[PDB]
Amino acid sequence: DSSSRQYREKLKQVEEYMQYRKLPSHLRNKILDYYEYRYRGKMFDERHIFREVSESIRQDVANYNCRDLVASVPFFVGADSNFVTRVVTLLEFEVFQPADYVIQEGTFGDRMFFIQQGIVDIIMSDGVIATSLSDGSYFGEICLLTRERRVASVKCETYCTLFSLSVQHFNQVLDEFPAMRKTMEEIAVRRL
Amino acid sequence: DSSSRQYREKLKQVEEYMQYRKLPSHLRNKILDYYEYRYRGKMFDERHIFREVSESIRQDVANYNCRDLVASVPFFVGADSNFVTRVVTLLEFEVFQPADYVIQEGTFGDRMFFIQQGIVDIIMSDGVIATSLSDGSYFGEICLLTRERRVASVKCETYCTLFSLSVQHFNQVLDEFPAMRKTMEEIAVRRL
Amino acid sequence: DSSSRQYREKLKQVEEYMQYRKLPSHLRNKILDYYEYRYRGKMFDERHIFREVSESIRQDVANYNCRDLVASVPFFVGADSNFVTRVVTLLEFEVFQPADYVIQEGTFGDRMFFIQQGIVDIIMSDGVIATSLSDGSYFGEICLLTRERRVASVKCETYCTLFSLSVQHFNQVLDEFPAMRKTMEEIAVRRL
Amino acid sequence: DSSSRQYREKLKQVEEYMQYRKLPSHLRNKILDYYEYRYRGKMFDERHIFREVSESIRQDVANYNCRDLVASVPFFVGADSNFVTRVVTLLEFEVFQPADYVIQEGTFGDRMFFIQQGIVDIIMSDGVIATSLSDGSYFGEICLLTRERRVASVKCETYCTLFSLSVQHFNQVLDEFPAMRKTMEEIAVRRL
Ligand SMILES: Nc1ncnc2c1ncn2[C@@H]1O[C@@H]2COP(=O)(O)O[C@H]2[C@H]1O
Ligand SMILES: Nc1ncnc2c1ncn2[C@@H]1O[C@@H]2COP(=O)(O)O[C@H]2[C@H]1O
Ligand SMILES: Nc1ncnc2c1ncn2[C@@H]1O[C@@H]2COP(=O)(O)O[C@H]2[C@H]1O
Ligand SMILES: Nc1ncnc2c1ncn2[C@@H]1O[C@@H]2COP(=O)(O)O[C@H]2[C@H]1O
């Protein structure tokens, strides 16, 4: 009930803002669809709760909420439990919509992404689709490894729920667990 | 209605503060005129909404709100779409009033400015007005390029609505898109 | 009464979040037990109050709240009053529960801990318990001194109330008071 | 009225916190006296208002609120208007009480202080009072210039209203206006 009020609250002011900005209907609808899809009529916080509790509770909760993702990512198979715990506590939940470009070829990158659910296309600079990726895969790591630029664009086919890891956190966890930098570099190369 | 309440709320406490500080009437009136001009009786947030949505929605909204500015700035003509998107997502809205000095000659600079609407005078250290700038122009870039000091003062003739880019973001976008540093340096020099 | 309302407020939304996340009952109960143990039905802030007052009031309040801890830590015996004041103003209160791992062997460390109340086991990488520590002791300092990795795990036997000092603050206070780095290094070595 | 409600609000929760912490009566009274002295039954914000307005309004308001201080500080006599404006916009208001040590000899310093109103004693490491300072004077600059340690303690005789400048801002304004570093160094030395 408190989570429901939070959402109705939010949605009212969103529609007011979109009115003052005279946003086109297509864009107003994109935004309303996003709130509905992501929040489904309820807005808790989690950030507040996480901060009120111990580091142990935060790890336990992050591990549970990310259980399905961890099981779906072959990358995490046989990984050190401390590695998995560190990553899941640093992941940020993100949602994207059909046809959204999560990544543009040739730009700088600030984070990488793990796919919880959804399908994305990997699009080369010439416009050819190299491949599509889905649940349990990840992308946007190459740029973080080379500190150069994005080598392909990534476009959502469906609604996508992703968990991102920032370049700062990425570099942190790979230093703490060097074995995982090695395994990561190997897939980067094998994205030919 | 919620945006209207936010504004009446705000204005009440502003007048109370100005009373405790015994601000002169001329200054109280300047402040009230500013709130009226900028907010026009309604205070949404945008910062909250932007943070609740995807990076794609943020780009779409920033691109739409900055559409007229982008069209008016010759600098953006033929620019890479990714460049324009990066800039507009980093711009900060600012409003200044007639006779305000946005920039003082001889000081350090922390940001540059794009003029959405308004007229400013460029005033040399001797007091001569070199020129006036208006909608679609920009200023305050020289200091960011040289990392030295402001070479002129800039004084508002009218109410001005500006979008600023901080030195940190300025240096970020120019590194990401070096071609635009080149075009920027060329106008800097051609401000003779 | 205001502190009580704050807590009932909080607990209501916590149970709602745990419902949306379908947390297992064991974990829901761990979280509820934590809030009850730590806050005991009342949530003040302290952070807000500390920020509304002078540095002197902040030192006086931190010194009083940490009086028992300071008396129990032999480390503080004969220490410079300015050293003790600096530390207590930088400590962060943390609570952990029975069987929680505060520290895992082999990871990077971001802070050290002083035990106000509770018992922890020091567990070597082979699983042998080297020793147990309790009220007035401290742990997690070795990693901060070597800038290497945690050399043992630390597991709570009881509920534990700890005060942590971050690596940044740790390095600050030791620079300001070098004599205490010396005394600290000596115990680090004498954790054989 | 809104400022009055804010204060009664605040004071209620302060007394509740002091109760949970079982603070001694002398300290509870020190805190209540501080709130009464500083806020006088009304809590506006200023930080919120400053952030809602232009840089020009912020400079105008800071200049007005600091007018008496600026007039009382001989240091500002003949100074560049841009220097004075920069400083006043970076000052932080602080209040201290009789017998408070604002500065302890031998510690590291994070800021310096301008005295709006009040009297402080400068106390050497041997306990001799070198001198007393009052309205329009400043102290705590030596440590910022040498990047060493505080050379004396500073103890309030009366209630003191001060404006502090952090080491980061201090170093900023002195770089922007080198002439003022020179004048500052000269008084530092002439504090024999
Ligand atoms: N052939 C490929 N197969 C799978 N993923 C790819 C391929 N080429 C590029 N990518 C991904 O697309 C991402 C785009 O941005 P990055 O260059 O950071 O890293 C990229 C890789 O994660
Ligand atoms: N002759 C000129 N014509 C147009 N703009 C100018 C001229 N001289 C200076 N400026 C602008 O005035 C701004 C003042 O601060 P900056 O030195 O950062 O950069 C400056 C340029 O943007
Ligand atoms: N033999 C020991 N006796 C007491 N404390 C210990 C012993 N071995 C390790 N520790 C503590 O266990 C902590 C684990 O993390 P750190 O390596 O940072 O530092 C460690 C010391 O504080
Ligand atoms: N003889 C003095 N006369 C006036 N002020 C002094 C004297 N000696 C020290 N101070 C001030 O006392 C302050 C204590 O800390 P700082 O060393 O940063 O800088 C100091 C000077 O501002």
- SSE order of chain A: HHHHHHEEEEEEHEEHH
Number of domains of chain A: 2
> How would you classify the quaternary structure?
homotetramer
Count of beta strands of chain A:
8
Proportion of residues in β-strands of chain A: 15-25%
| Biggest chain pair interface | A-B, 26 and 22 residues
Instruction: Describe the largest sheet of chain A.
Output: 4 strands, antiparallel
Describe what this molecule looks like in 3D.
Chains A, B, C, D: One of its GO terms (molecular function) is nucleotide binding. Chains A, B, C, D: This is Hyperpolarization-activated (Ih) channel. Four copies of one chain form a homotetramer. With 192 residues, chain A is an alpha+beta fold. The first copy, chain A, folds into two domains: 1-66, Helix hairpin bin (Helix Hairpins, Orthogonal Bundle), CATH 1.10.287.630; 67-192, Jelly Rolls. Chain A is 49% helix and 19% strand. Chain A contains nine helices and eight strands. Chain A has a four-stranded antiparallel β-sheet with strand order 1-8-3-6. In chain A, strand 4 (120-123) and strand 5 form a beta hairpin. In chain A, helix 1 (2-20) runs antiparallel to helix 2 (25-39) and helix 6 packs antiparallel against helix 8 (167-176). Chain A is globular. The N and C termini of chain A lie far apart (51 Å). Chains in contact: A-B, A-C, B-D, C-D.
